[PDB]
Write a protein that holds these residues in place. Sequence first.
Motif, mmCIF file in Angstrom:
data_model
loop_
_atom_site.group_PDB
_atom_site.id
_atom_site.type_symbol
_atom_site.label_atom_id
_atom_site.label_comp_id
_atom_site.label_asym_id
_atom_site.label_seq_id
_atom_site.Cartn_x
_atom_site.Cartn_y
_atom_site.Cartn_z
ATOM 1 N N UNK C 115 64.505 78.500 41.316
ATOM 2 C CA UNK C 115 64.228 79.481 42.363
ATOM 3 C C UNK C 115 63.663 78.844 43.619
ATOM 4 N N UNK C 116 62.681 77.960 43.467
ATOM 5 C CA UNK C 116 62.016 77.402 44.643
ATOM 6 C C UNK C 116 62.918 76.474 45.471
ATOM 7 N N UNK C 117 63.780 75.711 44.804
ATOM 8 C CA UNK C 117 64.652 74.765 45.504
ATOM 9 C C UNK C 117 66.050 75.294 45.843
ATOM 10 N N UNK C 118 66.509 76.330 45.131
ATOM 11 C CA UNK C 118 67.878 76.872 45.290
ATOM 12 C C UNK C 118 67.993 78.221 45.999
ATOM 13 N N UNK C 119 67.048 79.116 45.720
ATOM 14 C CA UNK C 119 67.008 80.419 46.374
ATOM 15 C C UNK C 119 66.335 80.302 47.737
ATOM 16 N N UNK C 120 66.035 81.438 48.352
ATOM 17 C CA UNK C 120 65.222 81.475 49.561
ATOM 18 C C UNK C 120 64.334 82.711 49.496
ATOM 19 N N UNK C 121 63.186 82.657 50.163
ATOM 20 C CA UNK C 121 62.287 83.803 50.221
ATOM 21 C C UNK C 121 61.940 84.139 51.671
ATOM 22 N N UNK C 222 65.494 87.942 35.585
ATOM 23 C CA UNK C 222 66.098 86.771 36.217
ATOM 24 C C UNK C 222 65.398 85.508 35.697
ATOM 25 N N UNK C 223 66.174 84.572 35.151
ATOM 26 C CA UNK C 223 65.615 83.369 34.518
ATOM 27 C C UNK C 223 66.006 82.097 35.262
ATOM 28 N N UNK C 224 67.215 82.073 35.819
ATOM 29 C CA UNK C 224 67.684 80.912 36.580
ATOM 30 C C UNK C 224 68.297 81.276 37.942
ATOM 31 N N UNK C 225 68.197 80.347 38.895
ATOM 32 C CA UNK C 225 68.933 80.406 40.157
ATOM 33 C C UNK C 225 69.517 79.021 40.416
ATOM 34 N N UNK C 226 70.772 78.817 40.040
ATOM 35 C CA UNK C 226 71.408 77.520 40.241
ATOM 36 C C UNK C 226 72.135 77.507 41.589
ATOM 37 N N UNK C 227 72.629 76.334 42.043
ATOM 38 C CA UNK C 227 73.197 76.298 43.391
ATOM 39 C C UNK C 227 74.338 77.291 43.579
ATOM 40 N N UNK C 228 75.056 77.585 42.499
ATOM 41 C CA UNK C 228 76.283 78.363 42.571
ATOM 42 C C UNK C 228 76.259 79.644 41.730
ATOM 43 N N UNK C 229 75.104 79.999 41.163
ATOM 44 C CA UNK C 229 75.012 81.192 40.298
ATOM 45 C C UNK C 229 73.601 81.637 39.909
ATOM 46 N N UNK C 230 73.501 82.898 39.489
ATOM 47 C CA UNK C 230 72.248 83.480 39.013
ATOM 48 C C UNK C 230 72.388 83.876 37.545
ATOM 49 N N UNK C 231 71.438 83.425 36.728
ATOM 50 C CA UNK C 231 71.398 83.773 35.300
ATOM 51 C C UNK C 231 70.283 84.778 34.997
ATOM 52 N N UNK C 232 70.681 85.935 34.481
ATOM 53 C CA UNK C 232 69.710 86.922 34.055
ATOM 54 C C UNK C 232 69.810 87.215 32.565
ATOM 55 N N UNK C 233 68.798 87.914 32.062
ATOM 56 C CA UNK C 233 68.651 88.217 30.653
ATOM 57 C C UNK C 233 68.345 89.710 30.538
ATOM 58 N N UNK C 234 69.043 90.400 29.639
ATOM 59 C CA UNK C 234 68.828 91.836 29.441
ATOM 60 C C UNK C 234 67.822 92.088 28.320
ATOM 61 N N UNK C 246 74.856 82.431 48.145
ATOM 62 C CA UNK C 246 73.565 82.641 48.786
ATOM 63 C C UNK C 246 72.727 83.586 47.929
ATOM 64 N N UNK C 247 71.437 83.284 47.794
ATOM 65 C CA UNK C 247 70.507 84.197 47.130
ATOM 66 C C UNK C 247 69.230 84.357 47.928
ATOM 67 N N UNK C 248 68.471 85.398 47.591
ATOM 68 C CA UNK C 248 67.141 85.656 48.145
ATOM 69 C C UNK C 248 66.378 86.496 47.139
ATOM 70 N N UNK C 249 65.379 85.886 46.512
ATOM 71 C CA UNK C 249 64.587 86.582 45.523
ATOM 72 C C UNK C 249 63.120 86.605 45.892
ATOM 73 N N UNK C 250 62.467 87.704 45.531
ATOM 74 C CA UNK C 250 61.036 87.854 45.670
ATOM 75 C C UNK C 250 60.382 87.040 44.578
ATOM 76 N N UNK C 251 59.343 86.270 44.936
ATOM 77 C CA UNK C 251 58.525 85.633 43.927
ATOM 78 C C UNK C 251 57.540 86.651 43.378
ATOM 79 N N UNK C 252 56.954 86.358 42.219
ATOM 80 C CA UNK C 252 55.816 87.132 41.725
ATOM 81 C C UNK C 252 54.524 86.629 42.403
ATOM 82 N N UNK C 253 53.447 87.410 42.304
ATOM 83 C CA UNK C 253 52.158 87.021 42.889
ATOM 84 C C UNK C 253 51.121 86.598 41.850
ATOM 85 N N UNK C 254 50.251 85.678 42.238
ATOM 86 C CA UNK C 254 49.039 85.419 41.471
ATOM 87 C C UNK C 254 47.888 85.128 42.430
#
Lengths: 429, 429, 429
Positions: C115-121, C222-234, C246-254
């Motif tokens: 997520x940090x290196x492949x997606x964008x926020x 959502x578990x993975x964000x690779x350069x060419x795809x997104x992997x999710x789990x149900x 292209x992707x854009x995902x919200x990070x979680x907060x701490x």
Amino acid sequence: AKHVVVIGGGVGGIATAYNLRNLMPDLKITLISDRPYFGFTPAFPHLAMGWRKFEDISVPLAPLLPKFNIEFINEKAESIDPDANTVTTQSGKKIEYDYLVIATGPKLVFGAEGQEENSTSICTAEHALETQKKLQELYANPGPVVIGAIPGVSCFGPAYEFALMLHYELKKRGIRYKVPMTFITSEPYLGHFGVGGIGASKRLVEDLFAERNIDWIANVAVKAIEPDKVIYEDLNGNTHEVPAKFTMFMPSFQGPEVVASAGDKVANPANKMVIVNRCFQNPTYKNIFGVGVVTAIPPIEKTPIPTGVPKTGMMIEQMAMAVAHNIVNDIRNNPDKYAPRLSAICIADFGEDAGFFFADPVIPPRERVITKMGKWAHYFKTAFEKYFLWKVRNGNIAPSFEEKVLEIFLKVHPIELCKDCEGAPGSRC
Amino acid sequence: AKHVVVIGGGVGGIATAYNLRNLMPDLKITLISDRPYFGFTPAFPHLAMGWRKFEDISVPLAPLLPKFNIEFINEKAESIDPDANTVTTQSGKKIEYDYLVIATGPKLVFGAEGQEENSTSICTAEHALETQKKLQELYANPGPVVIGAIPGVSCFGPAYEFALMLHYELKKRGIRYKVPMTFITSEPYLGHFGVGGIGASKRLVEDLFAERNIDWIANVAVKAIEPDKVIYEDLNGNTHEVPAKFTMFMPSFQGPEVVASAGDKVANPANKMVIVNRCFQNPTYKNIFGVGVVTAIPPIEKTPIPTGVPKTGMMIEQMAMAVAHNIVNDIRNNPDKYAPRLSAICIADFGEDAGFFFADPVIPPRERVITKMGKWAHYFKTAFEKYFLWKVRNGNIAPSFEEKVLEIFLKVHPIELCKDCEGAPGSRC
Amino acid sequence: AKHVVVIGGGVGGIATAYNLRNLMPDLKITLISDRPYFGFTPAFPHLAMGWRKFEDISVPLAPLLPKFNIEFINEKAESIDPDANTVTTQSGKKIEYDYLVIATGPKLVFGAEGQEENSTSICTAEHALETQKKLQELYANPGPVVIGAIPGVSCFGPAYEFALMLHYELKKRGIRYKVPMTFITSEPYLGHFGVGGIGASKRLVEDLFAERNIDWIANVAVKAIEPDKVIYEDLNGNTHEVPAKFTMFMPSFQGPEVVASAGDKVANPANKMVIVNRCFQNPTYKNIFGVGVVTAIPPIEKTPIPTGVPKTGMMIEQMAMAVAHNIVNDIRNNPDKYAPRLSAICIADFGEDAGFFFADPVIPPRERVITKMGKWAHYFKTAFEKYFLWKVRNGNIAPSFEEKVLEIFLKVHPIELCKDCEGAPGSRC
Ligand SMILES: Cc1cc2nc3c(=O)[nH]c(=O)nc-3n(C[C@H](O)[C@H](O)[C@H](O)COP(=O)(O)OP(=O)(O)OC[C@H]3O[C@@H](n4cnc5c(N)ncnc54)[C@H](O)[C@@H]3O)c2cc1CS
Ligand SMILES: Cc1cc2nc3c(=O)[nH]c(=O)nc-3n(C[C@H](O)[C@H](O)[C@H](O)COP(=O)(O)OP(=O)(O)OC[C@H]3O[C@@H](n4cnc5c(N)ncnc54)[C@H](O)[C@@H]3O)c2cc1CS
Ligand SMILES: Cc1cc2nc3c(=O)[nH]c(=O)nc-3n(C[C@H](O)[C@H](O)[C@H](O)COP(=O)(O)OP(=O)(O)OC[C@H]3O[C@@H](n4cnc5c(N)ncnc54)[C@H](O)[C@@H]3O)c2cc1CS
Ligand SMILES: CCCCCCCCCCCCO[C@@H]1O[C@H](CO)[C@@H](O[C@H]2O[C@H](CO)[C@@H](O)[C@H](O)[C@H]2O)[C@H](O)[C@H]1O
Ligand SMILES: CCCCCCCCCCCCO[C@@H]1O[C@H](CO)[C@@H](O[C@H]2O[C@H](CO)[C@@H](O)[C@H](O)[C@H]2O)[C@H](O)[C@H]1O
Ligand SMILES: CCCCCCCCCCCCO[C@@H]1O[C@H](CO)[C@@H](O[C@H]2O[C@H](CO)[C@@H](O)[C@H](O)[C@H]2O)[C@H](O)[C@H]1O
Ligand SMILES: CC(C)=CCC/C(C)=C/CC/C(C)=C/Cc1c(C)n(O)c2ccccc2c1=O
Ligand SMILES: CC(C)=CCC/C(C)=C/CC/C(C)=C/Cc1c(C)n(O)c2ccccc2c1=O
Ligand SMILES: CC(C)=CCC/C(C)=C/CC/C(C)=C/Cc1c(C)n(O)c2ccccc2c1=O
């Protein structure tokens, strides 16, 4: 003068023939059709309701097409020899071609056990007519009504239009309360239309049915149509029954035997429809073009109960505009090639009022959609009927003002210059 | 003069008795009721809310019925001897009958364990006034509110009304944000109403609730109502609980013991309600008729959680009208028998606005439906109340103009000529 | 003079500091911030779209704060020693305080792999400017866009904004039909926003996505964000894939480390966020207050995929007023404590039009909601931006008029007098 043979005297065939003719007067064009008439298919549900006379929605072809210097041959096309560049009709007449346009439309498959015997269909003037005879018995003895689509169906529209037109009819006759109505579809949800929805169609159609009290079961495979009931199967494999005195079900479509006989470079082995590329031209035999329902277009989504993609009127009108241009360009040695936008206006006549569906294009991702419902939409369809019949009768399916009206009103461009025709029809150049 | 006895001084009883007196001035009518007043049930939710004085929404019967030559007996009808043509009261006074109309309304079953003790209801004016006390405690120190319907319920309307009314009230004293609200119901979906929904009522009630922040659980069985909580069961067999400081749950209905006392020919063994045909007549004892909630009407739909079918004020007014003509026609030896249309105009008051429902008929399939919402509907509820009370006080529940009015605005006719009575009530004759 | 220390130069910090200044001109106030400027967070999605220049949506604090007698130190607060009443900075400077306000906002956690290196926020200005660059990469090379929220997210609004805005742009460039879109969320359904939806917001967003052809998958992790795809789990733990240029995902907060460096009486052991009561004050160290995103507020509901509650601008600026008064009343020996109402007024911008949402309070049960859509709402977001930045620049975040305008337009009081702070923040006194 090059020779273009068009197989099929319907929306696609007429439109390709008139397009080719208007673009090139010095062009020998032969049209071959098993029916002596062009039939306006969007009026078949109304014909089935007994609100149209056949003569109102058909145009005899043999006295007409000569007026536009087009040869009409009123026979079935039996086989195609794409190596010899030849079409053979049923009586044995061999016809040489320089270019071939296949436009035979749908070949019906009543894939449900007993569907062809105990159900009704509205897909041909012939079937729509024997439907009318059966509705006559429903009105006299009101029993339960079941309408819908079997698995594989790709044209869902008309069945919604039939359900709702019938509702209206029964309500005018003050007997709707004596007649339960169920709609059973292989669509995953109502208003999917084999296109994954058009805007908020799922919601528009769900409310339409609730308001007009039309029970529905979606996401199921109709297995059987008995004289007294419809048997179907859900995703767990359990079968269910629903009482039915009158039913109308959409058949699924397959390609014709004529295409099949051209070999598996022309005929798609899975459904016998015409293999085409983005330019609605065959990949292997580049002087063969398919236009209309008979063209093999892959589905938009692989639904849990198999569904296919509708080829609607406007889509075909664009297919015919693209194929005509591509033929002309080849003749004229112009390397330019065109793909049809494959966008669709779609009006579903609910009797008194109608649903307006616009998708641009139909195969996602879409630029825009329009979903509206009103009385105006019903009048628009009646007007459009009158208008299309006039076009068939007056030698031009694509008058230049139609293109510009569709620009001003919807920002629609019917065809684009395609840089690379290698790829699935509908896929973006 | 012939002798008809009406058991029950509610909507059905009064309506039937008054219709009889107006068709046949010289016919002797005896009305037996365990309450000295007529309860205007449609205003009981407002009484629970404290927006009515009991005196304003009730009509003492003793000084009133003798004005229309109706003999009133202020006692409970204990047993019915249908072979001997007799009713026996609580004090044991035998009254003989030529015709019998049963209109004892519902016997309430508080079917969830702990429901009678820990919950409130609004079904009787006694329970309504009690509920008023509990609402006072609630306003004093707010806590979770859960409202709804248990398994077996056939009158869902008043619970929707109460929830939304209570919302408006909590809000008008700025205390709503301190009060959670959950609606839990045996209906498969919200706005099912026991009738399979009314137009798009399911979409409309889900929207109402979401806008007013009322949480909801549908298609579950309320199994227990405790001082601190409400336990319910979903379709898997899993238990869930929900915190609750205040509950108001709709009881389920069953026939009374007086009906039970006649054979299994008059009393439906599954629920103790009166077996009636299409013409609301008992199949074996032709001089016995049922009107209102007491009548056994098969559910419109076997829902995963057992629900029944409402008998609304208009439905009952129609029953009473049909029965009156049926009795008089039988006295006068006229073969004409009448079915009630069983349509519903139903207004759900939401405090300052209200939802207008119209179903023709209530039991599907329907000819038409109206589902509207607005202020005007609330005012029309206040005004119809005043109107109806006037009707009871003046000895005509069915003035001629009222029918003509309903005919002009809604195209409704209260009663039909029945070709053949033999079949379930509500079924098409 | 008492000395109040604010950690945080954002919405929370500024609004607390300014508020204190206006209530007590003689109070000493020090603002510790690592960034030299206030960023107008609501305008970051626009910055990522390239419709803002950084200089327009930010204020240099170093020259500004001294104008309101606020000492600004441009360093990162490193540790808090609550037993010594101090804060130590990255250089090593120990600052004492009589009262402390923690308003550090969110520490972003990019949970998904890649997520940090492949997606964008779009959560910080640097990230947003970085996203613009990748959006350039897309406009030239059309491919699948996917957008959403990973598990544990709590700011869902900006993703909906971004998706919608991006759709508007793709359409502007005429390339929408070359670019699929999918919105993937940890929310159980669309328009949940971590608040159990606002009014009928689910119906609304779903319909919004349908018209505009934004596909969606809800209730997944959502578990993975690779350069060419997104992997999710149900929920069945079954692992799925979707293509993505292209992707854009919200990070979680701490919570930050500076909070963690105090006891587990100050930092919540689960999320490192600041423990506070109904009065946004710490239960143990009564002179520590938390304002904004850093404050630990329990989830409204435990969702199948974990989700949190958003802390929106209006909510935060209400925490600020509440905290302000609570420090002032402690200084002045007033036993009175206030809790913020926590009502949201959240405009989701879509480019040319926008979505108005009002939830009072955000945390259920609610007094009222308003959910609306139109062009005016878009001109209102731009207007509000200009207005807010004016407030920052002019030294009062709560002008008296603004509260009175809110009162008569939305019946909104920003703080409530609270008889007992002991309890979870957002729960009812
Ligand atoms: C019932 C029905 C309604 C319907 N309604 C539509 C509507 O309201 N709007 C709209 O946009 N589209 C609607 N469609 C779909 C589509 O418009 C129609 O299916 C078109 O008619 C399809 O056009 P095609 O050119 O693909 O086929 P065609 O049906 O017009 O006819 C082709 C011609 O070919 C002849 N033929 C068949 N086999 C032949 C052989 N072997 N040899 C020679 N000729 C052959 C045939 O005679 C015909 O003239 C709607 C669709 C429906 C249908 S379920
Ligand atoms: C709370 C509540 C509200 C309510 N609101 C309605 C509304 O807004 N519109 C509408 O159309 N219907 C509403 N209803 C339903 C319906 O209108 C009522 O249930 C009617 O009151 C039903 O009419 P009935 O005549 O069937 O019942 P009744 O209760 O009015 O009268 C029965 C009478 O019989 C007496 N009785 C019982 N047992 C007796 C014995 N053994 N012997 C003699 N008499 C007996 C009883 O005392 C009464 O007088 C609404 C319904 C509700 C309620 S839960
Ligand atoms: C992208 C995005 C958009 C967004 N849009 C919103 C909107 O349109 N309306 C709305 O009501 N809310 C929106 N929000 C949410 C929320 O309003 C914002 O996140 C606020 O900015 C939150 O305010 P806070 O005061 O809680 O945090 P802050 O982001 O302003 O930052 C506080 C300051 O603290 C500094 N800091 C971090 N760590 C520090 C240490 N160790 N020491 C000193 N200072 C520290 C930090 O630099 C900053 O100056 C929206 C939210 C988003 C985001 S994903
Ligand atoms: C000679 C070449 C000319 C060819 C003709 C070109 C077609 C012209 C297109 C007309 C536009 C149609 O689209 C128009 O949509 C709106 C709905 O948004 C409808 O308008 C409708 O609005 C609302 C509901 O939305 C109703 O209260 C109203 O009664 C109804 O009129 C119009 O009745 C319809 O006509
Ligand atoms: C002797 C005669 C007396 C007997 C009574 C006769 C009945 C009188 C008829 C009542 C009129 C019908 O009631 C009418 O319903 C329509 C439904 O479209 C409402 O029409 C509209 O109302 C408002 C806006 O104006 C909206 O909330 C609503 O969406 C809309 O439908 C009218 O606000 C209402 O006044
Ligand atoms: C001096 C400082 C004070 C300034 C603050 C003033 C705020 C005034 C706005 C309060 C009104 C409530 O917000 C209001 O929502 C209604 C919804 O019906 C909108 O009403 C309308 O919106 C537009 C036209 O304007 C239409 O597309 C829509 O059909 C209609 O509903 C208003 O456009 C909006 O302004
Ligand atoms: C509601 C709005 C904004 C605009 C509507 C006005 C429009 C779309 C006018 C265009 C008229 C026109 C020539 C449309 C072309 C048109 C075509 C080409 N086909 O194939 C149809 C098939 C079935 C039903 C209808 C049609 C139809 O309307
Ligand atoms: C909005 C449209 C098209 C029409 C509305 C106008 C109508 C429905 C006029 C009818 C007025 C009328 C005399 C209704 C009779 C009426 C009856 C008979 N019953 O039983 C009710 C029970 C509960 C609540 C209300 C009623 C009610 O309004
Ligand atoms: C549609 C209806 C009924 C009313 C319109 C609402 C109006 C006019 C509100 C008053 C305007 C005003 C000063 C609002 C204050 C306001 C505040 C306090 N916050 O925190 C916001 C956060 C994000 C986006 C917008 C705002 C915003 O507009």
